[PDB]
Each structure stands twice: as C-alpha cells, then as structure tokens.
Amino acid sequence: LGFLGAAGSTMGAASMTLTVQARNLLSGIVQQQSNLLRAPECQQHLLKDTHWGIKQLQARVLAVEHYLRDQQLLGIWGCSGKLICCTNVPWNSSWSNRNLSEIWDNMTWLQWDKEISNYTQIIYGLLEESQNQQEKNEQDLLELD
Amino acid sequence: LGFLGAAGSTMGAASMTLTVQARNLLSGIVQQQSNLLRAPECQQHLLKDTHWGIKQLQARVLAVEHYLRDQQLLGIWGCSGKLICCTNVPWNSSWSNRNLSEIWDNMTWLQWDKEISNYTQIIYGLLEESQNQQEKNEQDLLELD
Amino acid sequence: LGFLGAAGSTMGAASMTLTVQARNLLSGIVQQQSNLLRAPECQQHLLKDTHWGIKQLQARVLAVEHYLRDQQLLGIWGCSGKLICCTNVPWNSSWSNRNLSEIWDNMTWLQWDKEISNYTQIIYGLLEESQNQQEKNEQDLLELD
Amino acid sequence: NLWVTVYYGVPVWKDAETTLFCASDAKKHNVWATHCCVPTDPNPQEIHLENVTEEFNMWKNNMVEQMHTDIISLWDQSLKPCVKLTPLCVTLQCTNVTNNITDDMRGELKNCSFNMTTELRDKKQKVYSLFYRLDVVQINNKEYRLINCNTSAITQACPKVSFEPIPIHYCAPAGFAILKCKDKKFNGTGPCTNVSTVQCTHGIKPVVSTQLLLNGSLAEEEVIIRSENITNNAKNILVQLNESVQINCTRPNNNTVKSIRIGPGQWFYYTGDIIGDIRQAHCNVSKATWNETLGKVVKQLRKHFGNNTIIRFANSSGGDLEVTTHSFNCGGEFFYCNTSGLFNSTWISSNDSITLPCRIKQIINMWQRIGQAMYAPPIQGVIRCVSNITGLILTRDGGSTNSTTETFRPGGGDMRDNWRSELYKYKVVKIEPLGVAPTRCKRRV
Amino acid sequence: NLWVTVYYGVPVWKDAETTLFCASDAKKHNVWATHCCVPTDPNPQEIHLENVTEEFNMWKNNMVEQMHTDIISLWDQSLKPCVKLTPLCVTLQCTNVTNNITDDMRGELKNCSFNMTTELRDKKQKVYSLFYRLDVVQINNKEYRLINCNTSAITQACPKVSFEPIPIHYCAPAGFAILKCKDKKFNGTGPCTNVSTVQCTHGIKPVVSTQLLLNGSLAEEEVIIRSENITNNAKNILVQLNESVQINCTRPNNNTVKSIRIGPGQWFYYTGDIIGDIRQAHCNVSKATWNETLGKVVKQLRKHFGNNTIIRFANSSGGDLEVTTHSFNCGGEFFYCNTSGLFNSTWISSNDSITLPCRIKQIINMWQRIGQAMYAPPIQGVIRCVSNITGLILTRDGGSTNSTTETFRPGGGDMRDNWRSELYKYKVVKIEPLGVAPTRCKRRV
Amino acid sequence: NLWVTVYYGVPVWKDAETTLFCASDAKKHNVWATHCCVPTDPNPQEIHLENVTEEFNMWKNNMVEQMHTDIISLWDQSLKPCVKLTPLCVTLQCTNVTNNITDDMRGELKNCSFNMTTELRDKKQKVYSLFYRLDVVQINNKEYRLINCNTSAITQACPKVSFEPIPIHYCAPAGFAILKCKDKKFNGTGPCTNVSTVQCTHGIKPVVSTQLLLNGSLAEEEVIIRSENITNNAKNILVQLNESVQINCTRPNNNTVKSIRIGPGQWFYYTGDIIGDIRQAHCNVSKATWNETLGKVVKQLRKHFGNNTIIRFANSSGGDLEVTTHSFNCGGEFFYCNTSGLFNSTWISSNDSITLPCRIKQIINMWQRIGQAMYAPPIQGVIRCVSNITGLILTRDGGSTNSTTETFRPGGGDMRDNWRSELYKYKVVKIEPLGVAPTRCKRRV
Ligand SMILES: *[C@@H]1O[C@H](CO)[C@@H](O[C@@H]2O[C@H](CO)[C@@H](O[C@@H]3O[C@H](CO[C@H]4O[C@H](CO)[C@@H](O)[C@H](O)[C@@H]4O)[C@@H](O)[C@H](O[C@H]4O[C@H](CO)[C@@H](O)[C@H](O)[C@@H]4O)[C@@H]3O)[C@H](O)[C@H]2NC(C)=O)[C@H](O)[C@H]1NC(C)=O
Ligand SMILES: *[C@@H]1O[C@H](CO)[C@@H](O[C@@H]2O[C@H](CO)[C@@H](O)[C@H](O)[C@H]2NC(C)=O)[C@H](O)[C@H]1NC(C)=O
Ligand SMILES: *[C@@H]1O[C@H](CO)[C@@H](O[C@@H]2O[C@H](CO)[C@@H](O)[C@H](O)[C@H]2NC(C)=O)[C@H](O)[C@H]1NC(C)=O
Ligand SMILES: *[C@@H]1O[C@H](CO)[C@@H](O[C@@H]2O[C@H](CO)[C@@H](O)[C@H](O)[C@H]2NC(C)=O)[C@H](O)[C@H]1NC(C)=O
Ligand SMILES: *[C@@H]1O[C@H](CO)[C@@H](O[C@@H]2O[C@H](CO)[C@@H](O)[C@H](O)[C@H]2NC(C)=O)[C@H](O)[C@H]1NC(C)=O
Ligand SMILES: *[C@@H]1O[C@H](CO)[C@@H](O[C@@H]2O[C@H](CO)[C@@H](O)[C@H](O)[C@H]2NC(C)=O)[C@H](O)[C@H]1NC(C)=O
Ligand SMILES: *[C@@H]1O[C@H](CO)[C@@H](O[C@@H]2O[C@H](CO)[C@@H](O)[C@H](O)[C@H]2NC(C)=O)[C@H](O)[C@H]1NC(C)=O
Ligand SMILES: *[C@@H]1O[C@H](CO)[C@@H](O)[C@H](O)[C@H]1NC(C)=O
Ligand SMILES: *[C@@H]1O[C@H](CO)[C@@H](O)[C@H](O)[C@H]1NC(C)=O
Ligand SMILES: *[C@@H]1O[C@H](CO)[C@@H](O)[C@H](O)[C@H]1NC(C)=O
C-alpha cells in the first residue's frame, strides 16, 4: 500500500504493513544522505555554510536517537526481534473497555492511539517490570537444572 | 531505588535494578534533547553559537556510540535480548578465586569490578569465540536435519 | 587472520571470521574517538576549526547510520541475533545456477558478491515478506493455544 | 481474558516541528540554484491516504517560519563575501539632473559628485553619479549624504549573483512526513478529508512582495478568501485568485553603468548617466481584468460581510514605502508602486490600462530590519518584467459602526504572508511506529 | 563448577571528563540568561547512595576547567557584535580635572580632548571626555594616548548587555552522572562517605574576583581551609568562611554620560563630566566583623601551622593591579581596592569601618590575556553595591627558617580558584553498565 | 533444494569516497604539527591479503583531492589571525639599490620609501625598505606600488608559524579501509596482486613544488614513468626516480630585518638593508648526477616512444613564473629557479655543478588563485637548504609528424600531481559486511 498506505485501514489489516513502516526511518536516512553525497557541490555547502551543516547534523542525530529509543524499549520488554509480540501483562478495562472486535475490525490505529493515549506510560512501566521478573525466573530455572 | 540507587547494594540485590540502569542512557538523551527542543531561543543558540552547537552534537554522538558499542558486544556474545545471560565460557579461578557467596551476597558491583578489572578483555575475547563456535554448530545441526 | 584476513579465502573458510569483520565498525569508532579524546589540543581543534569539527561529526554520524541500517535489515529478516541465519526463502537458479561446492569451496566472498550483485534487492524484498508472514503465523499459533 | 500485545511499525503520527531539506530542480550563479543543493526526486511520488481525516491550520504552520528563517539566512550569506560600500559615506555635492525630464520626474533623480577611495590610500578619485532621491538626504551645489550612513553599514550586492526565485521544494527528513490537503474549498483551518502523504512539497518560488501576491498558485473553481479571523480587523486577509492578472512593469530609462575600483579588487557599480529622456517607472494592468477580479473578490467577501452590504476599496493608510506601496524585485531592480490606482471603487448590490507610477530605490532595508543595508547595483539598459497577480493582501479597516459599508485596503507587508498562502495545504508530522493494543494472546510462559 | 554470566545494567562507574550542559533558572539582556538556555529541572531530584564511598579531588576536578573555558568563551562571544573603538587611538590633549577635588584624587582623573570620527569620512568632531589615569599614558596641554594602543584593539562592551552573574547549574549529559560529597568536613581530597547522585549541580554564580571570594556559599560549622599542599608555599589556600562579611562599595561621583556616533550606527559612550565634587571610590567592612573573621581563620590555620606559633597577615607582595588589589565588577564598573587595610595584624597565643580606597579602570584586560581589550562604558549616576565575602585566597610566603612566625598574604588572582571553591564537592563519572560475574549457571546447549 | 542463508561479517568491500583523518607523528609552532592532531599508531600494523587481486587507478584516486582540499584549507586558516598589510597599498618612492651589485642583480632589487601607519591614527612613519622587483610595479625617485594592490588584499604570514612539511599519515575512518599496492612495477593503473590492508598510509610530506618533485619517495629497481595516457600530449608524465638528485639552494645575501608597528599590536616585517655584497640566489646539482638521471629516464621513455627514436629535452614553453620556473619553499623563502640549465640535451641511440639562477618573491599567489595574496616576511641572515629530486613532471610537446624526434619539457605546475605521485599506491574502500549465499539449510518452521 506504500508508506502510511494503511493509515486509514483498520488495525487488523494495518498490521500486515508493519514492515513498511518499520523500515521507513533508517531507509530514508540512508537515501537522503546518498542524494547529498552524490552532489559534491552540496558536500562543499555542508562545510561552507556552518549553520546549514549544523542543522543537517542535528536532524540526523535526532532521527537516530529516536530510532534507538524505540528499539531499546522493545529490547527491555523482550520484543527486540519482533514486529508483533505478546507479553505477560494483562489488559486493563480501565485503559479501555471497548469490544475487541471493534478495536481490530472497525478502528484504525490513529483512532486507537487516541483511545488509549493517557495510559502509554503505565503500560510501558508494566512491561518493563514483567520482563525483569521473567528474566530472573529464567536464570533460576537454569541454576535449578 | 532510582538511578544508581543500587550502587551500594550487593551484587545479588543489585541485579533487580538492571532495567533502571539500562534505560538511563537513551532515556536521558531524549529528555535532555526535549528540554532543548522546547526552548526555541536555545535552538537559535545552537546555530548562533558555532562552538556550542558543535559541543552538543559531539556529546550526543559520543553517547550514542557508547550505547551501540555495548549493544554490539552483547550481540556477538548471543545476549542481545537479555539483561542477564548465561554462556558456555567457564569461570577462571585465576581471574578470581573468591567464594561465590561473598561475590553475590557481600560485595557490591563497584567492588567486584575492581576485583576483576584486569581480565575484562580476556573474558570478552573468550565470549566471542564461544558464540562463534556455537553458531556454526547450530548451522551444522540444521544442515544435518 | 586479522581484519579482512579472510578476504582471499573461500567463502566456507571465510565464514569463521565473521566476528572479526562484524566488530570492526564500532570498535574502530570508539578507538579512533579515544585517540581524539586523549589529545586535549585536538579537542580544542574540533571547536577552533569549524570545518574540521563538522567533517568529523559527519563521518561519525554516517558510520553509525550504516551500522544501524544493516542491523535493521537483519532485524526485519529475523536474524538480529545471528552472524549466520537460515531463512524460509528458497534459492533461485535465475540468480545463480552455479554448483554449491564451487560456491563454498573455491570462490571467495568478493567473487561471489560479483556473481549475484544484481539480485540483492530481490532477495532482500523476499526476506522481508517471508518474515512478515512468519510472525503473523506465530501470533495465530499463540491465539489458537 | 485480554492481554497486552505490542506492535511496531504502526502507521500513526503526531503534529511536529522539524527542519526540512531545501531542494531545487537540478541558473549557474543563482543563489537559489545553490544552497538547495540536494536535488529533488524526478518523481516525488505521492501516496493517497484512503479514509484519513486530519486537521490543518495555516496560521499555526511552522513550515512558514522555517521558510522565513531560511530566506533571511540565505540572503545574509550571499552578501557576506561582497564589497562593502562604507567608503561612500562622504559628503556629496548634488544638484538636480537636468535633461529632457518629464514633470513627474522633476527633482526625482539627483546628480552627485564625491571623493571616493581608490586602490591606493594616497589617492582619491572624483566620481560623478546619479542617485534616486529616496536614497539621498540632506546634511543641513547642496550638501547630501546617503540615507543609511547614520544607521548602518551599506554593502553592495554582487552583480554576478542572481536572486531570481526558482521553485523550491521542501522535503521532510526521515522520520517525518508531509500531509497534503486536497480539499479545493479548504479555507486554512479545520479537518480535510482528501489527504495524501508526500516526501516533498511542490515547488514554491520564494517571491517577495508587499501587497499584491505575485507568481503563486491559483485557486481552483473560485476565489478563496482566507483569514485567521473574519471579524478581526487586526488580521490580514489573504485572497487567492482562481485567475491571474498580468502586470507589465518597466524602468523606461536606458542607464549607463560605470564601474570603478575603490580598493584592492573592490569593484563598485553606479549609474553614470542616462541615455535618452527621463521617464517615470511604471506598471500596467488592463482595467477590465482588474475590475473583474475585484468583482469576484467582492462576491466572496459578501459571504462573510453580508450580500446586502457595501464593499469599498481604498489605498494604504500610511507608513513608509515598504509599507504603503507595492514592492517587488524586477530583474534585480527595486520598485515601489502606487496602488491607489487599483484600490479605488465602491461595490453595491480599449484596455485603458491602469498605470501605476513606481519609485525606484537602490538602498534596501530588507525584511524591515535595522542593521546592514543592501545596495542594489544599477542595471545596464532598460528593464522589463511581466508578473502574474495570484493574490492580494487585504485588511479591513474595522472601526465599523454597522453602517453597512466596510472598507478594505491593500495592507499587509508581513513577508511571511507570502509563503503562508502557498504552504497552507501542508502539514508536518512525526511518525510514531510504536504502540499497543489488547488481544486474546499471552506470551508462552 | 562456575561459569561466566554477563549482566547489563550494572550500577557502576568510572572517573570521566565530559562536556556539561549550562542551565539557568528560567534578566532579559543578561549574557547568563541566555547561552545557558536549556532550563533546569523544577526539582533536580537527588538520589542518595546508601553504603557508597568515593574519592574526590578538587584540584583535579575537570569541572573547573570546563567552567573556565565557558566563561571565557561566553564573554568573547558577547563582545563580538559590539562597536570597535579603534578610532580612539589618536593623540589626546590632556590636562588635570580641576574642580572641588579631594587630596586623594589629585591627578587621578584627566580631562582630555580629541578629534573623533563621525558617520561621514569627511567629518571629525571634537570630543571632550574624562578618563581615569590608569587608562591613559603619556606619549612623550600634554600629549597622551590610551594605554592599550600599542598592544591591542579596544572594543566597547555593549551597554545593553548585562554581565551580572546569576546562578548557573551544570548538568551531566546522558551516560554521565554527578556525584556530590556531603561531608561537612571535606577538605578537598580523599574518600567521602555521604554521597548522592544528581543530574545537576546547585547554582553557582560565576562571580569574578581576585582576592576576596565574593557571593559564594558558606561552610557549615567551621571555617574550612583547603589547599592542595599545606606545606607548599607555591600553592594557594582557599579559605571558606562559615559566616559572611558584608562589604559596602561605592563610586561616589555622580557621572554624566554622553553618547556620540563615531560611525554608521556606531555609538560610543564616554564620561562627559561630573556633577558635584570629586571623591575617591571606596569599600567598607566593619572592623569587628573583619577581625572576628580572621580570628576564626587563624584558629584553623593553627591546626596546620602550630597552635603555639604566630600567624601574621600582610598585604600583596607586588605586581599589577590585577594581581595586587581586590578586583571586582560592581554594577558593570571595575574596582581595584587596596586590601592592605584588611591584612594588617599579628595573631599570638562604633563600627569604625575599614575603608579601602579603590581605583577605577575602563580598559580591562580580562583573564590577564594579551589580546583584545575591553572598554567598559561609563555608568550614569552613582554606583552602589553590597557584596558578601564568603572566602579568601591566601598564600603563605614561605621562606621560613622555623622562626615560628608565618606570614600570609592576599595573593591568588587565578580565576579558576573562584570556581574550584564551589565545585569542590562535585565529581563527574561515566556510567559503565556492562560487566560479568561467576555463577552456577551454564547456557543450555 | 537450496535456500537463502544470510551472513553478516562478510570480508568484502566497494570503491568509496570518504573523509580521512590527518594524523602526525607525535615542531611546536608548525602548522602541520597541529591540525593533524590525532596521533598515529606506534605500529599501524599491516595485514597482507593473501590471494586478493584489486584494481587501482591513481588518476581517479580521490585521496588526492582530499589532500588538495586540506592543504588549501589549512593554509587559509593559518593566515586567518595574522596582520593584514593593506596599509602598504600606498605610493612608493623607489630607486635602484646601489651597492656592490653583480651584473645579474642590476635593477633586481629596489630601494623604496613610504608613509606607513603607526599605532595612532594621527601619526605616520617613514619606512625605508627593500623589495624585489617582482613584487613592485610602476604606477605611471619614480612612482611604484605593490603588485597586488589592484587585485586583492595582502596579508602577512605570521613569522612564528612554520610551514615546514613533516610527514602526514592519512587514516581511514571506521567502516573503511585502505588497500595498499606493493607491485614494484605498478604504473598507476590496473590490477595489483600484492595487496595489503592498512588503517593509515605511510607518512607523506606535503611538499609543494612546480617542476621537480622534491623530497618524495623513490622507486625501487627502475625509474617508473606514469601517465594517464602515453600518447596524449595534453597529459602530464610523472617520473619517479629510483635514485635521488641532491640540490643545494642558497639565498646568498645576508639580510637585516626590521620590524615596526603599523597598528595596535600589528607588527610588520621588512628587509631593512643587506650586509655584504649583492648576489643572485641560485641552486646547484652536479652535472654527472643530472645527466645520469636523464639517461635513465630516457631509457624508460624509449619503451613508450621507441628505442630507435630521439628524445630531447627543452625548457618551459611560456607562462608566468609560477608556471615556467621551478618553484619551492626554502626555509620560508620563495624561490623561482630557471631550469633551462637542466633541460638542455638530445639523446640518441670536476662536478661542474649546473647552477640555476633563481628569483625571489615576497608576494605569493598560492595555488594560482585570484584572491587574498600572501606576504612572506623576510628572513634574517643567509638561507641554505638541501633538497632531494625524487621525480620530474614532464610533458611531451606533441605536434609530432612522426619525425622520430620527440621533445619533453619541464611542464606541469598542477599541485595535485605532487601528491598523486605518492598516493598512487593507495585506494579507499567501504566495507560491506552483509550478504547472502545458497545452502542446503532451511529455517526450522
Ligand atoms: C627536504 O628535506 C630537508 C631535510 O631532510 C629539508 O632541509 C631542512 O630544512 C629546515 C627548514 O628550512 C632546516 O631547519 C633550519 O635550520 C637552521 C640551522 O640549524 C642548524 O643548527 C641546529 C642547532 O640546533 C641543528 O639542529 C641544525 O641541524 C643545523 O645544523 C635553523 O637556524 C632554522 O631555525 C629557524 O626555524 C625554527 C623553526 O623550525 C625557529 O624556531 C628558529 O627561531 C628559526 O627561525 C631551522 O631550524 C634544516 O636545517 C634543513 N636540513 C638540512 C640537513 O639542511 C628541505 O628544506 C626539504 N625541502 C623541501 C622543498 O621541503
Ligand atoms: C551630471 O553631472 C556631470 C558632472 O558635472 C555632468 O558632466 C559634465 O558635462 C559637461 C557638458 O557636456 C562636460 O563638458 C563635462 O566634461 C562633464 N563632466 C564630467 C566629470 O564628466 C553631466 O552632464 C550631468 N548630467 C545631467 C543630466 O545633469
Ligand atoms: C574633493 O576634495 C577636494 C580637495 O582638494 C575638494 O576641492 C577643494 O574644495 C575646497 C572647498 O571648496 C576648497 O577650499 C579647495 O581649494 C579645493 N581644492 C581643490 C584643489 O580642488 C573637492 O571639492 C572634493 N570633492 C568632493 C565633491 O568631494
Ligand atoms: C574639562 O574640559 C572641558 C573642555 O575645555 C571644559 O569645558 C569648558 O568649560 C568652560 C567653562 O565653563 C566653557 O565656557 C566651555 O564652553 C567648555 N567647553 C566645552 C567644549 O564644553 C570643562 O569645564 C573641564 N572640566 C573640568 C572639571 O576641568
Ligand atoms: C583636531 O584637528 C585640528 C586641525 O584643524 C587641530 O587644530 C589644529 O592644531 C594645529 C596644531 O597646533 C594647528 O597648527 C592648526 O592651525 C589647528 N587648526 C585649527 C583650525 O584648529 C586640533 O588641535 C585637533 N584636536 C585634537 C585635540 O585632536
Ligand atoms: C636605501 O635607501 C635608504 C634611504 O635613503 C639609504 O639610507 C641612507 O643612507 C645615507 C648614507 O649612508 C645616510 O646618511 C642616511 O641617514 C640613510 N637614511 C635613512 C632613512 O636611514 C640606504 O643607504 C640605501 N641603500 C642602498 C644599498 O641603496
Ligand atoms: C610622506 O608625506 C609627506 C607629507 O608631509 C611627503 O612630503 C611632502 O611631499 C610633497 C610632494 O613633494 C611636498 O609638496 C610636501 O611639501 C612634503 N612635505 C614635507 C613636510 O615633507 C613625503 O614625501 C611622503 N613620503 C612618502 C614616500 O610617502
Ligand atoms: C474505507 O471505507 C470503506 C467502506 O467501509 C472500506 O470498504 C475501505 O476498505 C476503507 N478504506 C480503508 C483504507 O480502510
Ligand atoms: C548498608 O549496610 C547495612 C548493614 O549491613 C545493610 O543492612 C544495608 O542494606 C546496606 N545498604 C545497601 C544499599 O546495601
Ligand atoms: C591461495 O591459494 C592456495 C593454492 O590453492 C591455497 O592453498 C591458499 O589457502 C589460498 N589462500 C587463501 C587466503 O585462501
């Protein structure tokens, strides 16, 4: 469907394009930098114009930092290798008590993010604790055997 | 306990805060950058003052590089998804012949790092080789089946 | 054998040095930066000379971006934790119909890359789709159980 | 029995402010050919977003602020390596230019002489030159000085550098996307239902003007009147026309340009003399096109101010030329046109072109800043340019007593309005790929 | 049967040198209000480290060097866009200011006139102004020049920019942490057992002085004497008081400031004349507070030099004003006070304030560098400021023959000492989250 | 039944262009001691690549372009903080230096006087100095000006900064590697079978010259003639010798240097007078070494132009000194030597050193740019230097009618040729660790 082609799709259907969205950040970084590297005069511009050169580095550094921040969160939650991962944290009806079929078949991800936008930090804290406990349990199983 | 809250704790207890410490680097990067982004005059300062703008980028780039270096080491040792991982490299009494219970119940990580500070590069080389051998063995098992 | 020590080796033998090559990028980044950090006058140079300071940051940022791009590709293909990984994408004789034993025992990786240099983007697209399908299948197995 | 499932690569976003890339269409010495050095895509292919509604607000659009900052920065950089003209802050001996001069030009142009520096510190040269009166003021065969000498340094714009605007495309950095509104009736704010995502905007020429909006895009179907607040007389109204009005501008005097060294490679340009007679600079529009254009504007103003009320047009209320006249760059020359010839009508329930006399200035205080002033070198020969009026900046006087008659004037002058009128359809958002949702799935324990 | 287990997120660290963020407490034109643009946290919450002992060393603390570098850099930047005063390197015709002048001011202030530039190159103006003798030297109704003209360019500090120090907090970048020592008796080196971790230091005002340490923090409980080496007479002793001493400084002369253009927007400020009589600038402390303060210092010096030995105080040994006097910035004015009135006593086994006469200078060689000099514009009116002495920089003369009498003098002048005295409690460390340990666990094969 | 298997850490690479680090061997005030501040490894250990063949092309080697850019940038930076000499663009009153002057020096050196500025704007001083005729031109006891005053600003190179080249090593950034060709017969292009990988090149001294290549490396075994195209007379031929030729250069006149202030700390240096007689600067080579060297070059040229054909040498065809003479920096002085004494022979099927007279210039247009010119301050005393000729830049005249006689001349002058001749053995490649291959392995499902 293309980048954000699934934005108006319902969540269920939209999940089949997670790869499209996931790659867009670093792919875009290397292609944009390539267009810049392919123009020797533009490279001269990066040094000739101090402010422009700084603005470009700032933008690139920030883009990398955001990529990594999200990757670390997946890492600490035990989802580093997955686009889709299930965890051991139960869903709270206080975050949302909406019917599961509406959530996946009628709603889009944009609507959904709004639906639960004030619980993000709660869920993330819970995911962190759950994974921490799980890893300790795994070590105990290995010491036991 | 907070960031480094466990620094004076013994190693055993301290391991339960590995998540606290692990997240501090990238979390701090995005929050500090946010405070900078939220101050338009400060953004103007980044370009108006060439040296300040360079110092800030240098600090951010370096912080990212250290994050990644450590992540790669975990990667090559087969610990990319873990805060705690056991490996196939035996412990050498020549690095430390101290009692295991003192190490985990009485000593802190600061003390411990000093105890074995001259063997770090040895252990890391051994971990690298062990993982390399393991992955080849795994491929051989798949070709066999 | 050292960095690129295996470059003239055949592919089979060469695979035993994947760790050597894999670490060279970030290891080199931190050691080069260390040599720079260890020279206070050189640090003064980074700010005194605007163009030099920008060139150095540009080089470091680019090196990081390339590291990450490759890591993400391994991530989306389900190979984030491996130097060697097998997938569910069959090999096409249209890319290469050369004998497997020549490929691993006589040819070097340099020769091989040339042999299949025009199919890289095909293979990568196939790997992406295969992993996407696999992850959905895994979720379906968990919902089923 | 719902559990948290984490998804990465989720197609969602948030409003955001970032730095956009400036990219040209791959004009050898044009300042815009350079700088926006990263080339655009040959096909910046657009992706339509089916069933996506999003809210746009042109008066909160930070893309405008970025363009404004970049326009200023680029100009300051382009003048950085050029010859300073501070040696010109000398007393001048001036008289009236005497030639076959029309009535409207009497005293308009002055004939001045002065002692200028040369490449050697021990030598001076006598320079004879012509200046427009707007650039020269009295000190007390009379004593004059350049107008800028009591305020700021004057520098010469390099004659080899073109500032002719060419289309500029702004492109999002990776991690960001630009949402484009295709609603033909979009008035600058609120939800838009026909939205596509692009990596780059279309090209916008960075054309600068103060009253009439020149060389922009046209509206489809009808004239669109966009303002932050209709009833707020403190706000500007940006009117986007659905048809263009052609303007033919001239600087009828055939100028001879002289060039001297005033220092070591420091070349200075000035008007030496004028060939032929002296005529006033001016701009023409047909009366019919102009009158039809206003009739269309009025029909649309009436939807906001009443279709049984009276709309009249009047000229500028006051201020300096940079405020009261229509200013534009014509081939490097700077024109200040009297638009009272256009905004003179009352609307109620054989071209005879309107001729606007224009003044010319060489010392330009760009962006209305107090600081370094620019000297526009003279142009050899006769200048002609033709521009398209694609819009107007109007202000309502307000002060209304509900008399049923409202007055609009060619106000404005805020340069950001010139870009807001083109960038109104674009929004920048940050991509937020990570999120969670409930499902009947638990991690295997 | 122990195996290697790798742990990530280990709470350990190493000594490190990095770049800290400068952050203000969110003074419109103050140079310190700006620059340190990232705001501090409303609550830079501290985390105490239970059972952690760490070694601190204030004389090896690289936070001092960073502050020093940043102080210099900021000042050089703030003067960058200001008017240069190189047109003032002209011969001056000077006589003695003649008015109701007290004895201590005879010949102190000179009345000079000169030909100054104007906005036009063809015109000069006569300027009449007053200068302090310290800024003016003879060339041979006598011929004088400004003191800096044979060494470096002089530039005017912008009158609109305040340099008044405000508290500055330094914050660690992510990946680093600041360890704070709370040991009330900490002497600058060695282990500290009450240690907390913070992301930001408390605010330190970047106050500059040469002898008395002004507007710093006070010690708790007792006066603390800190020196790199007690018996090394080549080292400075930083004395931190546990009580403050108030100093009342004045510039009693009511000055009238004149301002002229010396070029295109180049405004220059100078003292035109003085209203009222002429008096010498001075600073007051009560005698009792000063004498009690020294008695406390002596009790503590005796723990290092013997409680049966004699401690005497004496004035500066020699050098320029920047070396021998107590220098400080009072509302933008620069004072050089004679502290011999303070350091005059021998300690063995009704305020009558001590008045220190002070000299004033307008040409300042900041940081004792040879290079661009700063011109401090005059201040209109009468200047008053009140400062707190929070410490002293003392040096022991040494050269001792074990006579049992030691002499201390108000030496120092090394600007880094002014900050070392506040940053002594902080250390910067790098976080090192990756490490290994033995355990009875093997990877499943 | 083959499947795709992905491998990471694959030892392969691609041609690439990146930025290299400049690193010195860890000359206090030498511009090359600084800048290339990152120290080299004590052992930049080389890794031989067994069974690797790679293609090199010295005329497409982008390492040359980087060095060129860095050489220019460093020089422009080093002159940035130095005294400008624009006050010297005054009229000069000049006569011929009259002393015991040899015939070859008659009119070569001029005795000039002028009014120079001082630290005060009101005072001038008379300066008497000597200039070489090449730096001074007539205006019309005769009137002269410095040659640069009608083109560009002249600045003084700081006398405290040394530009003496020291070995520079270029190092690849992480992610890149440098491949080094060890084939002793490598002619600049094509495959090389003895290839090693290094992180840093050997040190190359950034020696600048126009005709003879000085202080480079020598070829092993035989003279190697390398050119982009043998039969293209539009291309330069770089000849690398396998033996060195020693050149002894002198500036025989014992100069007395004077120094004055021309502004606030603005010290200016000039030759005041000369002690002893006046002699012409010159360079010596023995005739035997030079004649043997050419015989070797000819034997090798004959492999490309015929071993039964005639090779003759002739001097420069025309152009300015920067083009026609052999230019080099001798201890900070700038020499322009007449090489017609060397390139005068026809080759067919008791040292008597050749003496090349040399001219001296103080105003240098480095890199043949039009823009800021450099003033080389004079050097006190007598100058001696000894250099090694390690190569030649030759051009074939072409225009051949197959007469069997070809002519070669000491052409060139393109500074990049000086480095291409050393960097010819290095290539920069990007490491590409990710790739795929077939195998009998499928992921477990
Ligand atoms: C090709 O390579 C050769 C070397 O292999 C270069 O030749 C050298 O060039 C340098 C620079 O011109 C010469 O350095 C100068 O030497 C003068 C004489 O010094 C004598 O006494 C000292 C005592 O300590 C001995 O060490 C030395 O060997 C000599 O016997 C000095 O008076 C000069 O001083 C000036 O410069 C220094 C900074 O370098 C300042 O600090 C001083 O105040 C002063 O201004 C200087 O040191 C060197 O002697 C030459 N070597 C030889 C063997 O002759 C060629 O120049 C190079 N060719 C090209 C084209 O690059
Ligand atoms: C503008 O002023 C100049 C300067 O006086 C006039 O130039 C002179 O014209 C007379 C008559 O042709 C000549 O004899 C002189 O030699 C000219 N002087 C110089 C310095 O060139 C010029 O004519 C005036 N022009 C107008 C339109 O008033
Ligand atoms: C340029 O400078 C000369 C100075 O030589 C000016 O001519 C002088 O003008 C004054 C004022 O009337 C007379 O007192 C002098 O006798 C004149 N000198 C000579 C020799 O001409 C001249 O007017 C200046 N020109 C301008 C316009 O700047
Ligand atoms: C400082 O010098 C100035 C310059 O001479 C003195 O100003 C003159 O004072 C007399 C007496 O009141 C007036 O008649 C003159 O008109 C003033 N001249 C100018 C240029 O203003 C001033 O009085 C001197 N002040 C002191 C304290 O010595
Ligand atoms: C400013 O310049 C004028 C020059 O006009 C100086 O006054 C001259 O001084 C000299 C030296 O005594 C006399 O020979 C001239 O006759 C004076 N000229 C006139 C008309 O006054 C004046 O002294 C200078 N002022 C200062 C202090 O720089
Ligand atoms: C170069 O020119 C200077 C300037 O005239 C000559 O210096 C003078 O020499 C005579 C004779 O010895 C002295 O009496 C003068 O006092 C000197 N004048 C100055 C200003 O110093 C110098 O002799 C000339 N040199 C040559 C070689 O021609
Ligand atoms: C420096 O300036 C002085 C000006 O005082 C020059 O000397 C003058 O030269 C002119 C031209 O011959 C004479 O008309 C003056 O009478 C001279 N004045 C005096 C008092 O000497 C001098 O020639 C200049 N020197 C140089 C070489 O620049
Ligand atoms: C838009 O709505 C229609 C009607 O329900 C639906 O068939 C179509 O798939 C939707 N588009 C997207 C992107 O979900
Ligand atoms: C400090 O020591 C006491 C006494 O053994 C212990 O109870 C306490 O938990 C220790 N604190 C930490 C952080 O380990
Ligand atoms: C080079 O070729 C020889 C001969 O086949 C072989 O024995 C040797 O291992 C090869 N070198 C490498 C690096 O593969």
Residue numbers in the entry:
A (entry chain D), B (entry chain F), C (entry chain B): 520 to 664
D (entry chain C), E (entry chain E), F (entry chain A): 33 to 58, 64 to 141, 150 to 185, 188 to 309, 312 to 323, 323A, 324 to 397, 410 to 505
Sentences from the paper on this structure:
When expressed as ectodomain constructs stabilized with SOSIP mutations, trimers based on this clade A sequence can be readily produced at high yields while preserving the native-like, pre-fusion conformation targeted by known broadly neutralizing antibodies (bnAbs).
This nanoparticle consists of four copies each of two complementary trimeric components, referred to as T33-31A and T33-31B.
